[PDB]
Amino acid sequence: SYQDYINCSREALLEKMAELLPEKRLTHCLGVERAAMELAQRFGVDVEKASLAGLLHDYAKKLSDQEFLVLIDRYQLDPDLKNWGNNVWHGMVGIYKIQEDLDLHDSEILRAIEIHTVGAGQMTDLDKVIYVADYIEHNRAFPGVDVAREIASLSLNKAVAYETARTVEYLAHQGFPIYPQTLETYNAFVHYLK
Measured CA distances, 116 to 3, 40, 74, 94 (Å): 22, 15, 22, 11
Overall residue count recorded for the chain in this entry: 194
Q: Is 194 in the site for its own copies (CB under 8 A)?
A: yes
Our measurement of the distance from residue 62's CA atom to the centroid of its chain's CA atoms, rounded to an integer in Å, reads 15
Q: Is 58 in the site for Fe ion (CB under 5 A)?
A: yes
Q: Is 79 annotated as a binding-site member?
A: no
137 contacts 34 by C-beta, under 8 angstroms: yes
Q: Is 24 in the site for its own copies (CB under 8 A)?
A: no
Taking each continuous run of H as one helix and of E as one strand, the counts in the chain are: 11, 0
Residues 43-62 that bind its own copies (CB under 8 A): none
Residues 152-171 that bind its own copies (CB under 8 A): 161, 165-166, 168-169
User: How many residues make contact with its own copies (CB under 8 A)?
Assistant: 18
Q: Which residues are annotated as a binding site for ADP?
A: 25, 61, 140, 179, 182
Q: Which residues of the chain form contacts with its own copies (CB under 8 A)?
A: 161, 165-166, 168-169, 172-173, 175-178, 180, 183, 186-187, 190, 193-194
